[PDB]
Amino acid sequence: TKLKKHPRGETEVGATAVAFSSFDPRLFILGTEGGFP
Amino acid sequence: FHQSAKDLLDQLKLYEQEQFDDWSRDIQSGLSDSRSGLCIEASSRIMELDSNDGLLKVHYSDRLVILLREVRQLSALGFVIPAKIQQVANIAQKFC
């Protein structure tokens, strides 16, 4: 399971899609609803 | 150009705010009117519907997800959520 910037407040980090780089299992981007990747 | 385009832009800004104001008012009114009044998880009202289609009459039936989406929308868009909604939203979490 937790990405939250300034937890316990107006922080609801939801995303619509995620992509992962073939380069490395631990690199990926979250398509946040906020709009800023 | 500026005259026309600016007048249009201002109208667009007004459009958004008007739609928002209505949204906010209706949510605050609905909560204060008929949802703050001890909404409970009433059991299935079977006898009312003589078809075995037990009507689980609960104010929270739809409202739970509506409130969660409502606060998500306002938060993402950089709007202030009046306390009244934040309070019932935290309650909604417990029911969920």
Using the Cβ of B75 and the Cβ atoms of chain A, whether some distance falls under 8 Å is answered with yes
* Pairwise CA distance, residues A18 & A25, whole Å: 13
- This structure's resolution (angstroms)? 3.9
Q: Tell me the residue ranges of DSSP E strands in chain A.
A: 15-20, 28-32
Chain A positions touching B72 (Cβ under 8 A) are 12, 14, 33
Among the listed residues B63, B83, B82, B91, the one whose alpha carbon sits nearest the alpha carbon of residue B20: B82
List C-alpha distances in Å: B77 to A16, B41, B73, B74.
16, 32, 6, 5
DSSP summary character for residue B45:
B
Cα dihedral B11/B16/B19/B22 (nearest 10): -100
* Pairwise CA distance, residues B45 & B61, whole Å: 14
* Pairwise CA distance, residues B25 & B29, whole Å: 6
Q: Provide the residue type at B42 as one letter.
A: A
Question: Is the separation of the CB atoms in B63 and B92 below 8 Å?
Answer: yes
* Pairwise CA distance, residues B87 & B46, whole Å: 32
Experimental technique used to determine this entry = cryo-EM
Question: Is the separation of the CB atoms in B57 and B42 below 8 Å?
Answer: yes
Question: Is the separation of the CB atoms in A18 and A32 below 8 Å?
Answer: no
* Pairwise CA distance, residues B66 & B18, whole Å: 21
List C-alpha distances in Å: B69 to A27, B2, B12, B39, B65.
29, 38, 24, 20, 6
Question: Is the separation of the CB atoms in B90 and B68 below 8 Å?
Answer: no
Helix/strand/coil percentages in chain A, nearest 5? 0, 30, 70
Chain A positions touching B93 (Cβ under 8 A) are none
Using the Cβ of A10 and the Cβ atoms of chain B, whether some distance falls under 8 Å is answered with yes
- Size (chain B), residues: 96
List C-alpha distances in Å: B2 to B7, B8, B10, B12.
8, 10, 12, 15
* Pairwise CA distance, residues B41 & B62, whole Å: 12
CB pairs under 8 A between A and B: 10
Among the listed residues B56, B55, B63, the one whose alpha carbon sits nearest the alpha carbon of residue B35: B63
